Enzyme design. Structure first.
Site, PDB file in Angstrom:
ATOM      1  N   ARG A 267      13.656 163.982 -27.978  1.00 34.46           N
ATOM      2  CA  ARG A 267      13.351 163.458 -26.653  1.00 34.46           C
ATOM      3  C   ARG A 267      12.035 162.697 -26.739  1.00 34.46           C
ATOM      4  NH1 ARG A 267      14.913 160.817 -23.892  1.00 34.46           N
ATOM      5  NH2 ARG A 267      15.372 160.935 -21.649  1.00 34.46           N
ATOM      6  N   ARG A 268      12.105 161.370 -26.620  1.00 35.76           N
ATOM      7  CA  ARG A 268      10.945 160.532 -26.902  1.00 35.76           C
ATOM      8  C   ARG A 268       9.827 160.711 -25.882  1.00 35.76           C
ATOM      9  NH1 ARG A 268      14.810 156.587 -28.652  1.00 35.76           N
ATOM     10  NH2 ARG A 268      15.658 157.410 -30.619  1.00 35.76           N
ATOM     11  N   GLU A 316      24.521 160.413 -29.363  1.00 32.28           N
ATOM     12  CA  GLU A 316      23.908 160.639 -30.664  1.00 32.28           C
ATOM     13  C   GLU A 316      24.125 162.069 -31.148  1.00 32.28           C
ATOM     14  OE1 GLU A 316      19.600 160.658 -30.137  1.00 32.28           O
ATOM     15  OE2 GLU A 316      20.119 161.993 -28.474  1.00 32.28           O
TER      16      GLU A 316
END
Lengths: 351, 414, 133
Positions: A267-268, A316
């Site tokens: 989680r960026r 993803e």
């Protein structure tokens, strides 16, 4: 005794020079313990030498004598014996912090003006640096010519006898020889870090400390220790500017005698710095990674395995299950770094 | 001014005459009042109350209140006095790394002492130190990493050719990668450090492998250069060898920082030292031979903030230049004195790419060999930039540029 | 010697270099120089009270080194060195940590007590050493 050069290596073995440095730094030069011009002249060839210990001794004793002769005689013989210029050269090209401090203290006790240390990255000098260098080393007479011709640091490191004679106006051969002496003193002090790529400066300075000056000439012509075993005396003489045949021969003979593993998804916006910590920890062990659109699918297809770091994404998370790939998640909801040490141990035992 | 420095000195004498760690917090409050106060008052007060030995005594808790107080009193005078005897206490404090309320001040002290000289940097690297900052680059703390980045930057700008080999052998690019993520200032400091490290050419491929340079480009293109976060002429001169280099990353960092300092020095000083350090000519060369779009935009922004005319980009197809193009190029690179000679003799782009030393000496009027060498430097800079598409038929330019990037100039002659 | 030559490299010079770089003009001298040129880890770790009788530690240092026994007299490099030291000499006229490092590992110890010529004494001691070590 260590100023002599024939017995220097035998006065170096019987270790007592190592006591001179940490001793001068201890005390203050206010001692009062008169010499006379002969004894005072006996102390200039000390601080005119190498070895960094004789130089501190000379600076210390010159400080003492400067204090004394300024208090009592109000005059200075020091300009006659040649001290001031060597003290200025000490302040200019110093690397020690004690020797330069003593030389500054001396130069200030007499009445001359303290020069500043020059910048050691010569090939990046503008014109102002060249002017200050000229003023420091004593060629204040040629500043106007060196300015109206706009010499850089590069044009300085590359100028020859014809351009000195004709363009800069240095008319006599003795003045040109003095200038080249000072230049050669500067070239064995420069950096050459922004133009080398091969550390040729040290290969040269290993043969003889006199040879470290030829590095800019050998480098501006596109050479390095891989290409150096093909040159000849003609090229060394004309393209690189090595005049002394002895040096050309000693250089020729010496030169001839020479896809990812992990795809860290995360989680960026939440718990991202841990992905980078894992990045650097795995990379420091030998596991190629790929962290930072379809190139992510094209890469995770080629990735050996996976690491699920949790603290757009549904697409993803399904690409690491469909194909046959390994997965080692890392859960976060003790040292975090001891934890990561354990994780990389688990990996190097597993992968 | 005067009464304020006198009151500060009085309070300092009282708090030094006045067991425990008392009156050290009072010294901290006085230092804060002085620093947050123009700000020359804190400089004068710090140089009048920095008895550095006294502070060095408490340090080998009370060590926390000592180190937290030393951090503010570090100026060139205090730095010089510490450098002689201050390296037998702080290098040992750095050996222990447990408390976070103390590691902050130790990191700050190391940051300041890295900006002293090359001897101090070489002494703080092999004899411990630079391990405290690489180790503390794993603890996620806001105001500590903002020191471990500035220290890794100052150890690279200052220091020498050997300290940078050391910083690369100790893996300071990898350990800087995590710091380049969101702060928006920690990232700037990390990018500056990596740029200064990649300016060196001996370690460029090993700073390239540990991929963090790829974060500099996409970062400068993000924000605006109105930051306000004064350096001094020496630190300003430290920034020109960046934008005088290759790699397109150091160049963008240099353009960004020069923009910030140009804004600051035009607002506050109304004057520009930038002509003395050589900035304007390199910024004009950036605007001239640029291929990126962010770097040239920043260089235009900088050049316009100072008060010089923005050059236009030249046309990269040199063998097709008329006389007007030659005149604009002459004016841009700085040979405005020979424009009338080049115009009278009517040089094309071809006669330009093919002129020699005899025609320069005799026909154009370049009398001295130093001027001719400058001109050929500029010419060779231009010939490794031209197009050569309309006169090649064989792509020899790339066969030459494959051997050495310096050889791409010989294609027109060949 | 301004061109870097010396006794080791002199056997490789030639007449052109002697004529141009060194300034030897007379050909007779150049020939007579060419032909003539071509026919051409520690042992003792003395620990001591640095404020109490230190000069005897230095006297032992010099007497020992004058025979062939390396010394390391002058922090952890002292442990790292005494580990490599062949033996030890306790000179007596912070410390509890250095006195236990000479017993922890297997090393020889020859103390030198001070509470006759002091130098005759040290001659006797170095004789005892050269008989022992």
């Amino acid at each position: 005794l260590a100023t002599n050069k024939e017995v220097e290596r035998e006065v170096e073995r019987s270790g007592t020079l190592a006591l001179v440095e940490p001793l001068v730094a201890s005390l203050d030069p206010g001692r009062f313990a008169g010499r006379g011009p002969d004894d005072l002249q006996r102390l200039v060839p000390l601080l005119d030498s190498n070895r960094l210990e004789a130089q501190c001794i000379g600076a210390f004793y010159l400080c003492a004598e400067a204090a004394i002769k300024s208090l009592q005689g109000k005059t200075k013989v020091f300009s006659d014996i040649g001290a001031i210029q060597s003290l200025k050269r000490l302040v200019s090209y110093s690397t020690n912090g004690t020797k330069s401090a003593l030389a500054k203290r001396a130069l200030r006790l007499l009445g001359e003006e303290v020069p500043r240390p020059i910048l050691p990255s010569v090939p990046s000098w503008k014109e102002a640096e060249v002017q200050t260098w000229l003023q420091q080393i004593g060629f204040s007479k040629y500043c106007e010519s060196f300015r109206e011709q706009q010499v850089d640091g590069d044009l300085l490191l590359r100028l020859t006898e014809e351009e000195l004679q004709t363009d800069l106006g240095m008319k006599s051969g003795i003045t040109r020889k003095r200038f080249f002496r000072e230049l050669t003193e500067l070239k064995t002090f420069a950096n050459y870090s922004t133009c080398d790529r091969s550390n040729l400066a040290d290969w040269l300075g290993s043969l003889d400390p006199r040879f470290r000056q030829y590095t800019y000439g050998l480098v501006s012509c596109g050479l390095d220790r891989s290409l150096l075993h093909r040159v000849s005396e003609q090229q060394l003489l004309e393209d690189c500017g090595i005049h002394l045949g002895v040096h050309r021969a000693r250089i020729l003979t010496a030169a001839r005698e020479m896809t990812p593993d992990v795809f860290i998804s995360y989680r960026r916006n939440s718990g991202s710095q841990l992905a980078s910590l894992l990045k650097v920890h795995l990379q420091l062990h030998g596991f190629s990674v790929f962290i930072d659109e379809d190139k992510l699918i094209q890469s995770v297809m080629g990735a050996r395995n996976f690491v699920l770091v949790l603290s757009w994404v549904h697409k993803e998370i399904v690409t690491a299950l469909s194909c046959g790939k390994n997965i080692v998640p890392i859960i976060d909801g003790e040292y975090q770094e001891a934890t990561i040490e354990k994780i990389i141990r688990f990996l190097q035992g597993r992968s | 001014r005067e009464v304020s420095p006198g009151a500060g000195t009085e309070v300092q004498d009282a708090l030094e005459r006045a067991q425990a760690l008392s009156a050290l917090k009072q010294a901290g409050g006085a230092r804060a009042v002085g620093a947050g106060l123009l700000l020359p008052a804190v400089g004068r007060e710090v140089a009048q109350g920095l008895d550095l030995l006294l502070r060095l005594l408490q340090a080998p808790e009370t060590r926390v209140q000592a180190a937290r107080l030393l951090e503010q009193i570090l100026v060139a005078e205090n730095r010089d006095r510490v450098a002689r005897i201050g390296l037998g206490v702080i290098l040992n404090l750095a050996k222990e790394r447990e408390p976070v309320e103390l590691a902050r001040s130790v990191a700050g002290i190391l940051e300041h002492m890295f900006k002293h000289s090359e001897e101090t940097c070489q002494r703080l690297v092999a004899a411990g130190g630079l391990d405290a900052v690489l180790y503390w680059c794993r603890r996620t703390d806001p105001a500590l990493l903002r020191h471990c980045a500035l220290a890794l930057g100052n150890c690279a700008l200052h220091g020498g050719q050997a300290v940078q080999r050391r910083m690369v052998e100790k893996r300071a690019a990898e350990w800087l990668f995590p710091l380049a993520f969101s702060d928006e200032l920690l990232r700037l400091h990390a990018c500056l450090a990596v740029a200064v490290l990649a300016t060196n050419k001996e370690v460029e491929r090993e700073v390239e492998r540990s991929g963090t340079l790829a974060l500099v480009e996409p970062l400068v293109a993000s924000l605006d250069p109105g930051r306000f976060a004064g350096r001094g002429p020496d630190d300003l001169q430290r920034l020109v060898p960046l934008l005088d280099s290759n790699r397109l990353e150091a160049q963008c960092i240099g353009a960004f920082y020069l923009c910030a300092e140009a804004a600051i020095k035009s607002l506050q000083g109304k004057t520009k030292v930038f002509s003395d350090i050589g900035a304007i000519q390199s910024l004009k060369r950036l605007v001239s031979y640029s291929t990126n779009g962010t770097k040239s935009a920043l260089a235009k922004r900088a050049l316009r903030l100072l008060g010089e005319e923005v050059p236009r980009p030249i046309l990269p197809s040199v063998p097709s230049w008329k006389e007007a193009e030659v005149q604009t190029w002459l004016q841009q690179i700085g040979f405005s004195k020979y424009c009338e000679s080049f115009r009278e003799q009517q040089v094309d782009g071809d006669l330009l790419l093919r002129l020699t030393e005899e025609e320069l000496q005799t026909d154009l009027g370049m009398k001295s060999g130093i001027t001719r060498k400058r001109f050929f430097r500029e010419l060779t800079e231009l010939k490794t930039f031209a197009n050569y598409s309309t006169c090649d038929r064989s792509n020899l330019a790339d066969w030459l540029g494959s051997l050495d990037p310096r050889f791409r100039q010989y294609t027109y002659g060949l």
